[PDB]
Structure formats: C-alpha cells, structure tokens
Amino acid sequence: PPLQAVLVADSFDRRFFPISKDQPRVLLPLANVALIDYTLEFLTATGVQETFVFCCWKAAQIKEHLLKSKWCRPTSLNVVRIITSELYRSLGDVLRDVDAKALVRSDFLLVYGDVISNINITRALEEHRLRRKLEKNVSVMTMIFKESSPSHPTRCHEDNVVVAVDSTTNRVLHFQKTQGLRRFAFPLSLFQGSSDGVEVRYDLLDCHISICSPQVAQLFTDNFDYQTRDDFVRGLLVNEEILGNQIHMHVTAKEYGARVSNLHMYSAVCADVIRRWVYPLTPEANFTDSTTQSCTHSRHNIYRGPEVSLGHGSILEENVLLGSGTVIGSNCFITNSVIGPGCHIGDNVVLDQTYLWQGVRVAAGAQIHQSLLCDNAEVKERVTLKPRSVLTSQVVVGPNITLPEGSVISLHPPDAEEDEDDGEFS
Amino acid sequence: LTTLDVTKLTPLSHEVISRQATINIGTIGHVAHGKSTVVKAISGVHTVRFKNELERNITIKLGYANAKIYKLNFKLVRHVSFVDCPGHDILMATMLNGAAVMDAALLLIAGNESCPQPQTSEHLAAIEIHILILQNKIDLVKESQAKEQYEQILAFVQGTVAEGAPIIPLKYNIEVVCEYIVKKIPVPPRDFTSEPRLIVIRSFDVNKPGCEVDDLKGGVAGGSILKGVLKVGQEIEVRPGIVSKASEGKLMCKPKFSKIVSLFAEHNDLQYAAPGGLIGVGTKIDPTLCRADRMVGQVLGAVGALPEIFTELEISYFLLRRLLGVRTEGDKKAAKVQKLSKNEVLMVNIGSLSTGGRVSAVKADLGKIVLTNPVCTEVGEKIALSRRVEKHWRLIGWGQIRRGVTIKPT
Amino acid sequence: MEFQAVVMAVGLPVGNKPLIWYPLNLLERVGFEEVIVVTTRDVQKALCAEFKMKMKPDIVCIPDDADMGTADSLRYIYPKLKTDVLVLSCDLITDVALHEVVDLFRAYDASLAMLMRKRDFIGVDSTGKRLLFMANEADLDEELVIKGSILQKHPRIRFHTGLVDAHLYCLKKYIVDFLMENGSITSIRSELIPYLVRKQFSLKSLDIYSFIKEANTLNLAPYDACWNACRGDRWEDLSR
Amino acid sequence: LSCRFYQHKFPEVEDVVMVNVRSIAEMGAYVSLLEYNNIEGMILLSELSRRRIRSINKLIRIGRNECVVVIRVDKEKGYIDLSKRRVSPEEAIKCEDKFTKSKTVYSILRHVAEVLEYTKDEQLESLFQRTAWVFDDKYKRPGYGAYDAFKHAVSDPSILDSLDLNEDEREVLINNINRRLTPQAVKIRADIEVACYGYEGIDAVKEALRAGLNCSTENMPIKINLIAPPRYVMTTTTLERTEGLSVLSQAMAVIKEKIEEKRGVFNVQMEPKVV
Amino acid sequence: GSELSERIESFVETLKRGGGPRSSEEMARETLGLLRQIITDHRWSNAGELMELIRREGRRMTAAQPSETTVGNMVRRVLKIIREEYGRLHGHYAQLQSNIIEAINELLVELEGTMENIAAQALEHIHSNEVIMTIGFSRTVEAFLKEAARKRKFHVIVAECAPFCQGHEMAVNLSKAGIETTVMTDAAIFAVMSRVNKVIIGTKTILANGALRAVTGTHTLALAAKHHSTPLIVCAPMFKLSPQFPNEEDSFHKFVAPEEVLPFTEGDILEKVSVHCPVFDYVPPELITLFISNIGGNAPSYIYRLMSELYHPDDHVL
Numbered sequence A: 001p002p003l004q005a006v007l008v009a010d011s012f013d014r015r016f017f018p019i020s021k022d023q024p025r026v027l028l029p030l031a032n033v034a035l036i037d038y039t040l041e042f043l044t045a046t047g048v049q050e051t052f053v054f055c056c057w058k059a060a061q062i063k064e065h066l067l068k069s070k071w072c073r074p075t076s077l078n079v080v081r082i083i084t085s086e087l088y089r090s091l092g093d094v095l096r097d098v099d100a101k102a103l104v105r106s107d108f109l110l111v112y113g114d115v116i117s118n119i120n121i122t123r124a125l126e127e128h129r130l131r132r133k134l135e136k137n138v139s140v141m142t143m144i145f146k147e148s149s150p151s152h153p154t155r156c157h158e159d160n161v162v163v164a165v166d167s168t169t170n171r172v173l174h175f176q177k178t179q180g181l182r183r184f185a186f187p188l189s190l191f192q193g194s195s196d197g198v199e200v201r202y203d204l205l206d207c208h209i210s211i212c213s214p215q216v217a218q219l220f221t222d223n224f225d226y227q228t229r230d231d232f233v234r235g236l237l238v239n240e241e242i243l244g245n246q247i248h249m250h251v252t253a254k255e256y257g258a259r260v261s262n263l264h265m266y267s268a269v270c271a272d273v274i275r276r277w278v279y280p281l282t283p284e285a286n287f288t289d290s291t292t293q294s295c296t297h298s299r300h301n302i303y304r305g306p307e308v309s310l311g312h313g314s315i316l317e318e319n320v321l322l323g324s325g326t327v328i329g330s331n332c333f334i335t336n337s338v339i340g341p342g343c344h345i346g347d348n349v350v351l352d353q354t355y356l357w358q359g360v361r362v363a364a365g366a367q368i369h370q371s372l373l374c375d376n377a378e379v380k381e382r383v384t385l386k387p388r389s390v391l392t393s394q395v396v397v398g399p400n401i402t403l404p405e406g407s408v409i410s411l412h413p414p415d416a417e418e419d420e421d422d423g424e425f426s
Numbered sequence B: 001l002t003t004l005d006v007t008k009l010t011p012l013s014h015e016v017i018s019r020q021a022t023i024n025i026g027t028i029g030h031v032a033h034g035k036s037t038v039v040k041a042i043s044g045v046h047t048v049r050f051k052n053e054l055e056r057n058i059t060i061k062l063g064y065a066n067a068k069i070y071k072l073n074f075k076l077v078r079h080v081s082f083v084d085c086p087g088h089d090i091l092m093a094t095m096l097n098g099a100a101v102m103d104a105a106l107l108l109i110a111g112n113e114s115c116p117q118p119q120t121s122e123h124l125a126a127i128e129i130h131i132l133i134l135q136n137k138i139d140l141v142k143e144s145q146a147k148e149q150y151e152q153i154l155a156f157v158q159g160t161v162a163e164g165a166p167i168i169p170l171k172y173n174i175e176v177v178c179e180y181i182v183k184k185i186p187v188p189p190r191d192f193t194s195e196p197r198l199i200v201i202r203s204f205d206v207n208k209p210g211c212e213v214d215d216l217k218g219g220v221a222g223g224s225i226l227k228g229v230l231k232v233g234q235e236i237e238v239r240p241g242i243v244s245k246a247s248e249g250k251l252m253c254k255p256k257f258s259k260i261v262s263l264f265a266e267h268n269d270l271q272y273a274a275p276g277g278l279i280g281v282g283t284k285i286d287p288t289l290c291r292a293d294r295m296v297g298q299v300l301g302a303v304g305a306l307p308e309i310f311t312e313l314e315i316s317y318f319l320l321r322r323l324l325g326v327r328t329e330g331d332k333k334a335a336k337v338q339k340l341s342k343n344e345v346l347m348v349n350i351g352s353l354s355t356g357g358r359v360s361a362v363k364a365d366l367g368k369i370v371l372t373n374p375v376c377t378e379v380g381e382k383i384a385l386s387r388r389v390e391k392h393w394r395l396i397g398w399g400q401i402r403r404g405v406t407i408k409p410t
Numbered sequence C: 001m002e003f004q005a006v007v008m009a010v011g012l013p014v015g016n017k018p019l020i021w022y023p024l025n026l027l028e029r030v031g032f033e034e035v036i037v038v039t040t041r042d043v044q045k046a047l048c049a050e051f052k053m054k055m056k057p058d059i060v061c062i063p064d065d066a067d068m069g070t071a072d073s074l075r076y077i078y079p080k081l082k083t084d085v086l087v088l089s090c091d092l093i094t095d096v097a098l099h100e101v102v103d104l105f106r107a108y109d110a111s112l113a114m115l116m117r118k119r120d121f122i123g124v125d126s127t128g129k130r131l132l133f134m135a136n137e138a139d140l141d142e143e144l145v146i147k148g149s150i151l152q153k154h155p156r157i158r159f160h161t162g163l164v165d166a167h168l169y170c171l172k173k174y175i176v177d178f179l180m181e182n183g184s185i186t187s188i189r190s191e192l193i194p195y196l197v198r199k200q201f202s203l204k205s206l207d208i209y210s211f212i213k214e215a216n217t218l219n220l221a222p223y224d225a226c227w228n229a230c231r232g233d234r235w236e237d238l239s240r
Numbered sequence D: 001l002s003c004r005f006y007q008h009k010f011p012e013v014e015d016v017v018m019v020n021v022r023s024i025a026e027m028g029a030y031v032s033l034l035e036y037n038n039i040e041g042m043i044l045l046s047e048l049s050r051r052r053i054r055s056i057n058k059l060i061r062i063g064r065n066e067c068v069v070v071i072r073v074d075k076e077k078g079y080i081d082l083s084k085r086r087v088s089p090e091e092a093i094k095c096e097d098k099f100t101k102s103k104t105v106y107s108i109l110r111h112v113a114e115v116l117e118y119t120k121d122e123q124l125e126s127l128f129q130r131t132a133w134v135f136d137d138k139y140k141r142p143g144y145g146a147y148d149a150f151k152h153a154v155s156d157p158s159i160l161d162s163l164d165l166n167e168d169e170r171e172v173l174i175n176n177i178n179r180r181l182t183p184q185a186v187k188i189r190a191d192i193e194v195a196c197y198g199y200e201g202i203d204a205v206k207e208a209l210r211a212g213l214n215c216s217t218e219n220m221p222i223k224i225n226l227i228a229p230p231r232y233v234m235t236t237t238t239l240e241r242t243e244g245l246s247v248l249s250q251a252m253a254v255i256k257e258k259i260e261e262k263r264g265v266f267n268v269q270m271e272p273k274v275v
Numbered sequence E: 001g002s003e004l005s006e007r008i009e010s011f012v013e014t015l016k017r018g019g020g021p022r023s024s025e026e027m028a029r030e031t032l033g034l035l036r037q038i039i040t041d042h043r044w045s046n047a048g049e050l051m052e053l054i055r056r057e058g059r060r061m062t063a064a065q066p067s068e069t070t071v072g073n074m075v076r077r078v079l080k081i082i083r084e085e086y087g088r089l090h091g092h093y094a095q096l097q098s099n100i101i102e103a104i105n106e107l108l109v110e111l112e113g114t115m116e117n118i119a120a121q122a123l124e125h126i127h128s129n130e131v132i133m134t135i136g137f138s139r140t141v142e143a144f145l146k147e148a149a150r151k152r153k154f155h156v157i158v159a160e161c162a163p164f165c166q167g168h169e170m171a172v173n174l175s176k177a178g179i180e181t182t183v184m185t186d187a188a189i190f191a192v193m194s195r196v197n198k199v200i201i202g203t204k205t206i207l208a209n210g211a212l213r214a215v216t217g218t219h220t221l222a223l224a225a226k227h228h229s230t231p232l233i234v235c236a237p238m239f240k241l242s243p244q245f246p247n248e249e250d251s252f253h254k255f256v257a258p259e260e261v262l263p264f265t266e267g268d269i270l271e272k273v274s275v276h277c278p279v280f281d282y283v284p285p286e287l288i289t290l291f292i293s294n295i296g297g298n299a300p301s302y303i304y305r306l307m308s309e310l311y312h313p314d315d316h317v318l
C-alpha cells in the first residue's frame, strides 16, 4: 500500500502577528530555507509517495514558492497536490474536505506546514498497521512524541503537554495542556478501564506528526464541533462508551521532531537546526536544489556561504550562519545567529542570538541582541536593541533611539506596537 | 406472505393491502438503553435486519423498527414503526421541526423512582406535540408498585395539566400495551398525492467484497419518506447531489438522477412505497457516490422538488433561557443556553436533515448560519438549533428561515 | 542497635498456626534479638497471655488500651524507643526476604521505606523505588490532583492500582518525634504516608521509598483473605 | 555418478565453454570444464585480461563460474588452453544460456536415470546418446537442439516416441520433461479504478465491465472483481505473461474507452504485473 | 533518459539522507552499475565529452555526500580508464565502448575479490597467542580475523565507539567464531596499550599522502601505537584510496546529530552548551606502518605510486 500524507500549510492560530500579515508563517526562513521545504524534505525522508498541501491564507504566494522548489519537479519521487480554497479556516475543515474528496486510502500521515523533523516512522507505521490488523480497526490514531525535559527551552509554557498513557501497549488515556494550570487533575475511569498499567508522562514534546487512519476524517465529518486536533482528542477520550477508537502513542528518543508556534519555538528550533540537532536536514547539506543556499561548514558550527568578503577583526565564535552575498564589515562579533543572503553589516557591531533575514542593512555601532529582522530591513547607526524585539518588512530604526524589551514594529499600526520611519519618534 | 401489487391509484394510511409501514410512533422516555429491549419485546429482536454496516452516527440517527400488530391465524390491519433515537433531544429536535413526525409519542417511564430523566422526557414530549405512558419496571412488590403508581399518577396529573391522558402501569403487559396503542392511537393524515421526498438517514452498500462483474448492486440508500408515494422505476432526484469544490471557490452541488430499481424494506416490500417507516431504496447509483453513510442528508425527490441547495441560511434566532427539563441537584449555571456567539458550531435539524453550521453573523433577532454541507428542505420551514452541552447534542432553540443563499449546478 | 522491631495488634491467631508466629519467625530468623510486640485490647484484652506462651528468644509484651489506633501505639512507646522503628502487624504473611527494603532504607538515606505487593493508587518514580504519590478513592472529593513541582522534578510517574499494603515500614526518629509533637494523627497508615508524601513535594528534603514485590502477598483482617492463609502457609512455611 | 554434456569429449577451437576455477599456479589457473565431465583445463596468465596484471588472484576468483574461449586443444597430450581475454559479453551471455539449458537437460536425464536406477555410467551414457545426443547430431546444434526437442516434447510427446530406449525409460523421460520444463503458469494481476458519476452510473460500470470481459482472449479469461467501491481488480491467470500483460493492458484500454464514452473517469491504480 | 535521471536522483538523495547501502562494497558495485548504465545509454563523439559528462555528474555525486569519497575516487578511476583507452586507441565508437565495458567488467571482477584476497594474505600477518586491537566495525577486518583464527589461536580487543557502539555487533560476531574477544570502552586505549602486541584496523578513506580518515578515536589509537611502538595494519580495499589532500579542501569530518553524545532529556543546560560529534578522525601517515590491500602489503610511503597507477593529476579537482 502507498503512503499518503496531508500537510496543513496554514496555521489557523493568530500568533505570528504582524509577521504573518506579509508572508505566511510556513514561508519564513529558519536558515535561508522556508519551513515548507523542511517539512517536505522530512516527508521524502519518511518515504511518502504523495502529499496533499492545504493552504488558505496567501495561498498563491505559497503556490509560487513551492512550484519552483525541488518537490514539484517531475523527477521527484514524492509528488504534491496543491489544493487551494478560501472556504476552510480550520484543520477539521481540511480533514472533512479530505473526506468529501476521498483522497486518502489507508493509514495516511497528518502534518502541519511548520513541522521540523527527521524521524523515520516506519516502525511506528508498522506498529499502527499491526494494531489495526489484530484489533480489527480499533486503533485509529497513532500520536508521536519526543522524549524531552520539562525545563528545556524548546517546549514553552504555552505548548507544554501532559498525557497519561498505558505502559505495555502505549494507548493514550488522557491528554491535556498546561496553559495556566499549577495543579493538574486526571480522571478516575482510566484506572478502572485498564487495571494492568498506567503512567503519567510530562517528558513528551509534541511534534504534531500524528499518523492516523482515514476514520478520523469520518469522525470530523460526524462531529462538526471538533475544531482542531487537541479538542478532537479531548472529546474522543471522554466519549469512550460510544465510538471508542483508542488512540495509541509512539515515542522517539534518538530523533528530533518539533514545530513552531511563536517566537520562542522559532528561536529554539532555529538554534537546534544551527546546532545540527535535526541532522541530516542541515544547511550546508543543501537538501533542496538551489545555488543560492550552498554552504560550507567550518569548526564551532560556523556556516559560510559564497562571496562573503569577511573583514579584519570580525569574530565568529559559535553557531553562525552567513548567507550568499552577505557583506560584513570590520571588528564585528557574531554568535548564535543566522544571517540571510545579500545583507550589509557595519562596523563594531554585536549579534547575540539574533535572526537576520535577506536584504537587511545594519550600519556601524549597532547593538542587536536576541532580535528578529525580516526582509529588506534597514538599521541606522548608534542604536542598542533589547531581547525579543521584532521588526518586519523594511522597518527603519532611526539613530540614537533605543528600543525596549517588548517592542514589535511594523508598517501596520494596530497590529504592531508602533510604526517607524527615518526618525523613530512617530 | 403479503399480496401487494403495483396497481394503486389512491391508497390510505390504514390500508391492509400494503401491511409494511402504516403509521409511525415516537418513543422518548427515561430508558438509558432500555427502549431497544422494549422494541425487541414488542416487535422482534432480529426482525429488522436488511443491510448492516459500521455505526457512524449513533447519537445523531434514529432507528425505525416495524411491528405488525395483529388481532383476531391472526389478522393484521395496521403496522406501527417505532422510532427509537439515542438521546431524547435529537428526537425532540426532529419532532419540533415541521409536520408529520412522531405522531404517537410513547413515554417509557420507570416505576423505580421519580428522577429528572422522566421530567426531561415529559418536557421533550411537551415540546414535541397523543402520549402513551408505559411503566417498564416489571417484577416488583405489590405495595412498592402501588406507591410507584401513586407517584406516577401525580406525575401524570402534572402531565394531564400539560398533555397527559394515557393509562398503562412481561409479555402480557406488552400485549396489553399493544392493544391499547391499537385502540387509542388514531390514523394520522398523510399526503400521498404529493411528490415523494425520501430524506436519507442511513446509506448502505449492497455490493459485497469481491463480487461478480454482472451481479453488482450499488446505491442501496435508506431513509424516511416525508409525503407522497414512491414507486419502483420512477427517476429519483437527489437534491443535494455531489457537492464538489473543484472550481477553487464556492462548491457546486450537481444533482445526480438515478432510476429507483427497487424499494427494499426490512421485509419483502412491493414496488409501491408509502410514508411512515424506514424506506430503503436501491437505485441505479454508483457504489462510490453512495458509500456507508455518505449520501445522508440528501433529499431524494421524485418530481423535481423546489428546495434548492442552500449554503448560508439567515433564520430567526430564538433560543431558550434554560434547558427543557434538564436540571440536576447542583444546577451551577448548567441549564443556561448562552447567546449565539460568532464562529460557533450549531446542529440545525431541518426536519430529518441534521447539518452543522457556523454562526457567521447575528443581529439581535436574525442569525445567518453558514452550513458546512448543502441543505435543501424549504425556504421558510421551522429550523431547529442545537448545541453540545457535555458530549451530547442538546436542543437550544428554534426559528424560521428568513433568507437563504441558494445554488443549483448541472 | 539500628532497628527496634514493633509488631502492631489492631482488630487473632485463627489459622493452621499462630498468626503472630510468622512475623516473629520473620524477625527472629534474621537478627532481631530485641522484639517489642504490643497487645490487642479492642476485641479482647487477653492476647498477652497467649502471646507469652511462645518459644522465641526475647519478646517484650505490653498492655494497651481498647480505643486506640496505630499512631496512638507509636506515641505510647515513645519514651522506650531510641533508634529507628520497623513496624509490623499480625496479619503479615511475607515469604519475601525483607533485607531489600532495609537496603532501600539504608542506601538512599530514606526517611521512610515500605513494601507493597500485587483501591489505592500508588504513583512511583520511573526507576520503581521512590514513591511520589499515593491516595485511596474514599477520602478524596475529586478524582486526583497532581502538583506541577512533582511533574517538573519527575516527568514520568508510573501508577499502580492493584497493590496491597504489607504493613512493613521503616521509620526515622524525627518522624516519630513529629508524631509525638502532633497528636492529631490516629491511623499511622493514613497519616505517616500522606503527610510525608505531601511534605516531600517541597534541595534538602526527605526521601520515601517503596518496593513492589512479585512473590507473595499479605493477609487481611476480614475473612476475605482467610482462605488464602492456610493455602499459603502449607507450601511456604516448610522452608521456614 | 557423472557424465559429459555433449557427444564430444573435447571442445573445438574458439569454442566458449563454462568453467569453474579450481586452483592457481604460476603458469595460469587450473579450471574444470563443467560441460565435459570435469576435465582439467588451464586459463593462461597472459590471457586473463587485456591489461597488465600484477597477480593471477586479482581476477581469478577460485570457486566462480566463468566463460572462457578455447585457444589450443591437444587430445593426445591432454592439454587444453583457455582464455578469458577473447570472450565478449554477448558471447558470455550466450554461453551462460547454453550452459543453463544443457545443465537443465543434464538434470532431467539424471533424474530419469535415477528413476530407472541405472547405477552404471556406461548405461547412463547410452541413455544420454539415445535421448539428447541423437537430437544434437540431427539438428547440428549441441545444447540448443536437445533443449528445443525437450521443449517440443513437453507440449507434443511425439518426439519422445521416436526414442527406442525402453518401454518405461521413455515414459520416465517424458514425465521428467513434463515435470521439469513445463512450468507454464503465471498470473498477471492489475487494479483499475473505473466509475461514472452520472445518470446511469452503475449501468455504465456494468457495461464497461462486460466490454472488458468480452475482450478476453482464449485460454486467458480476464476475471474482474470488486475489490473496492471505486476500485476493481482485473486478474488474468494464463501462461505467456509477456502476451498476458499486453492482453490485460488492451482490456484496460478498452474498459477506459468504454468508461470515457459514457462520461466516466477511468484511472489505472496498478499496471499489468505478475503475481 | 527518464530511468537514468531518476536513478541518478535517487542515488544522490540516498547519499544525501543516510548510509545507503550499509556496506561500502555494495555502494561501489552500484556506483559501477550506475556508471555503466550511464555510458551504455548516452551518445558522444569525443572522449572529452564523456569526460566532461562524468565530471559534471561526479561533482553532484560529491556534493551529495562529501564524506563518502568512494563514489568520487571510483568516478576518478573510471575517468582514468577512459583516458587510458583514448590514449591506447589514439596512437573508435563501438570498439572503444566495448573496451570500456569490458574494463568495467574486469574491474567488477577485481572488486568482488578484494575481501577474499585480504583474507588469503591474512595468514602471513597473524601469529599464535597474539593481542589484537580493533576500533569500530568493518567487514574487511572481520573477515581478516575470522580467517586468521581458522588455524591460529589469539585474542582480539574490540574497542567500541563512543557516539554509537558499533563494535558490539563486531564483538558478538567474532565471539561466535571463538577468538576470545575482549570488549571495553574508548577511554582505556592507552590503558591497554602496554599489552597490545599489534593493532589491526580498517579505514574509511585513504588520503594521498598516506594519511587516512576513519572512525573517530583511531587517531588516539594510532598515537598510542606510535608511543608504544606497536605496528599498525590497515585492512583497506583499493576503492577507499583517494587523492583528496587533508588540508586542501574543506568539509573533512562528517558532523552528525549530537543526540548520540548528549541526549535531548538533559535539561535546561542544552541551550548554553555546544555539543559536537565528529564521526570521522584524521590520522597522519607517520603513525601508520603498513597498508594491506588485495594486491598485498604497502608502505604509507608508497601510496602515491598507487595514485600513479590509478588516478590522473588532471582529475583531482573533478
């Protein structure tokens, strides 16, 4: 049997504002590569034969981004199916359009458009297939989690997930989040339903690559109130007397899998991709065929593109990526940051955990720490930036104007904190 | 065996020539999976078995069980189709959505206590509407059943203050209840001269796995006939049809016409089919177009029914304050139907068509619900509105359709 | 001396042999030249004369009151205990050698060490030794509650539901000092377990450990486990 | 118990034979001729390759079968000079196919002699000369003629009736030939998704199925089965699978044309492949 | 056309993602098969056009995986075969193509018998009651030891690898033959080097100056063998020999995911730490005493001549 997959390339949460107001969150570059290309490379490394990309907001931009990619070529082993409609605005709507179109056949994969992973789940696929073969289509969904620590900077407090599963046949009994909860309550029927073994797990990072039967599309057509994945699981776990449909679980301890939801997950997944945690998906490996992203890997995870023309006194000590055509001046100090292609950096500048995209221009004497600079940006001289400062789509920051810690600037007034110009004062 | 034929001009509801589906009878009480046992004890355990499949919508669909109540080598005159629905709220929303639905309500009450399930059943029976009270707590003591009958007589006095005048307190009691239902429940007036509208509730596939190339039966759908008479050979008219969104925009609903090859009920039915029962029609449709519970919610018309496929219906928002007879001992803001918020899913039950729709806009008496699937019932019919309270779809209000956005492709 | 073994008597020798002899044999087989055994007075205050008719090396029998619990008997022998307390009971048929629970008490410097065997939900750490939660389904209004600190310090907690309490404890001196300082405790199996399990969720703290045996099981006060006492003693007391 | 493969005990000049290397010396590689009753030959060190060769063991692979052309033969002296340099890959494939057919004929006659319990090698050689070498001398083709006569006798046993060996030996040889060289069995299975979302959908589906079943040739019935609601399995259990796959493709094309004539889609879920 | 391009793209993606296949001999055989499938289904008039086509395809094949140099030096050996055939036929369309085809055929016959020649010459390098030290896992040194143990009795110390223990399967495969295998960690190498008689290892890539990249931890082992003056044996075939100089080109070591070194369940300290995992290590030629290939034994001061017998200096850039 073939291996189908659906890819929700439109995250329906209003989190990347006003970053997603210009280009969507699945087209942002981690290290000069959009997350669509990362997820599609993960899908071809898995071994799928055909995918179904679903995109609603700015879907023409996603379409023109991925038609010129490696996966739309006729020599690609994994074909794609671009499906465009502005009617759906939820993952359950995507799955009920899948059920209405009858695209999938048996044991299809479910992934978001912003999932970074390198897990081979053929073992979990065979486990799901044997669990469907013995119990006669009782197991419907196999969620996938990664072994992680609760104090890790990858999983934040907004996306921490605590489950309660079985120990010997790993079926999920309870599943919830910690969104503003200091004390957790678990039901009592999970012990009466299974007197053989039960374990509460908080060490599980969610990667949202939960493979599933085509019966979840049927259950989404029946229950219209199920909006997304987590309330669907929370409703299936409490409705066990009718339509039981036990959800099983797989854990990964040697492979990486995560997604993005805000600037914190973006920063953590970018720092993990730069530190080669998602190997083989590596920036110098060039998994997509493009000449503008070919790179070389020196010591201390220093990634250097072509035609950089590095200056005297510049220090690159740890976890530095430089795009193609990035102009770097003298006496710089860059660490734990990614720089886009075609940038211009001044003199006596520091870069601490920043994320600079293509087309930016940083003048001399600028102090940038833990920021995010989007496309075609401009930064003047004598400026000091604070952590968690976002500027999107060619925001110019005037001279002698420091920004606070919480400060997001864009061209849209009510979505961002303010709008900038050649002078930062209004 | 029956002796029906295809020679009929104007049949009646109490016609003994058909003897398949004469009248329908609703059943809503305090059963908690106890009404199916009463329907098996009244009609038969394995009597209703025509085409089984996987249970897709258990709490949303209602099952019809035929009963040929005979009298005196007995003689049968009229048959009763008992309609058992999982959850009384779905049966109440199906009854309070128009006409010719749940003509004979059967109140299956318990002679054990006076809990709130019977109060919610009485509230649903008052919101639906001829009631038929029946005690199922058999094999009790004499004085205990006397005190339970006194408590049920007080509950029936409150019922008779609303609508409450049946009187019935294991096989002998079932036979007495069947005789009382045959002697008390009159024949309801049904329109047989109108066009046949078969609202599908449960579709099945008659083709087995690995069948022959010539012996291939496809599109054996099943539902309920609202009005009219359906004969074999008549070209059916699926009002919803195939809804395809391949044009990258508004979905087009192409009506698929299929000639009705046979009308296969639970028994060996004839060519003519009347209303008031689970009518199963095997037409000349494809197996992929009519899969297991895929063609549900489609009005299978006969003469080109006027109801067009509506995508957005602006109706009159009229929600109740509290739940109909649902109030526990705590009642800590549990029976409190909230207002129609934006982007909220609601189960609009237009007759037998239970479709989900999101509340796109609402202005103070008018709510424009955008339905997920295309519905085609009428332009001003009484449409209900439900909401899942706690893992159960419960009714929240009713209204009348003021406007709609229609679409009809070809 | 490291331990002072105390055998509790709450409402006894009804079986194929004396029910108090098997804990006394389990104590006198390995060490325990000083054994303290309390007497029962709720059912009948005459079991001391029957317990003093045995043939053990050294038994210390004391009279007790009728209306008393386990914590009252811990507080009753407070001026005559100078070391760690190792609590027993009458209905304790244990074919498991108890050296391993003393190893769990000594090696991790635990304040409490108990033994369970295959009502009460016991959540233990993933190593299988240090308990983190325990609760009965009777005195709980909700189903269960779990703090965030015990999930942050211990991200996986394995829960068991088919466990019984063998009433084999190992107490520290400051625990019974707190028990003498707090006289509101009556049942030690419901007080010293739950209050210490709550106080362990504080660095510098206390350690509670438990072993889950898989060889045999204990008995009960009622007649539900009285049929398995003779069938368990006819095949396991031959090697003892 | 062994014999040679052909009526000649020694190969001719420039005749490519199949050998296996047995030992390595300084003068060359001692081999055994598998189709001439394991007589000893020698592949020369100068003839092992067209390139300067440092060691004989770099391309010898003692234990591996190889095709070598005969350069010099001496029946009196017992010297057989072989060469791996002269042989072409086309001649090597021809010698491999000829050795495979001759080994199949040798195994068939060895099974026939084991059924006849002829323990003597001279009686077994007489069975060889009466069964295979007579056809090889009649058709003037060693290896090809005997295998062609046995493939014709597996279908029409009139060629085996001309052998005057014995009454039971001819029947045992015919049974061994029909059990060894007559495995004519194949199953070309294919999946096709033909449907019609129109007025007479099931009627057009049944008409396309009848048109596909009517195109089934003789001794090759294309059996159609409903594996799914939208998918169908068109199997064909017949010999000559190179023609059976073409017949299944023609039936699938006829079914697709009959589906497209009645306004219905017809996708190919699986091509014609052997089971 | 289509089949060739999809096989080339699948080969590039298989070299890009992981180790496909497992053994290097099957990878060399499928590289020969890909090259012969390319040259039998293409058209050329001059040999320089075929040279530039094989150069353009080999640039992509080394850009797919720069650590896997087997495809690179195999493409270079095929290019020198093209150069020798054009030189011997210049001083030519079907005869030249048949000569290249039979040269690739006899190269495959040579490639199939490397391990049996190494096992055949294993008898003149192992004596009885010997202490053998081996790092990592390779089938060449395993066949070496399992053929030398057919007539001799000795002891092998199989040291595991610290990122991923690949020596455990080699230890349980050698102990089935009964060679008294001793297993230890990587930190005891000098702590066992006072008793090791001879070190016999394999490698991943033989460099041009006699140096070698191999599995990590063997540069330390070669330093300890030079300190204790024990001879070093490299059981390596003739397709792991490459002209790529160590300090010339970048991307020498293959860096892999740090989950095998430091797991993801470590805690909050994974943000303020920098974990590297180089799976390969560089060994200079002065710490090597003897190379063992199918043609026999060679000094590390002789590998250049093998270059002059297998590679052209004009093809070193590819």
Ligand SMILES: O=C(COc1ccc(Cl)cc1)N[C@H]1CC[C@H](NC(=O)COc2ccc(Cl)cc2)CC1
Pocket (backbone or CB within 6 Å): E129, E130, E131, E155, E157, E182, E192, E195
């Ligand atoms: O038993 C072993 C196992 O070796 C190890 C296994 C594991 C580890 Cl961690 C370390 C060493 N090695 C033997 C090998 C023969 C040797 N020598 C002899 O037995 C005889 O000694 C002589 C005698 C004469 C001469 Cl010329 C040389 C050595 C002793 C040690």
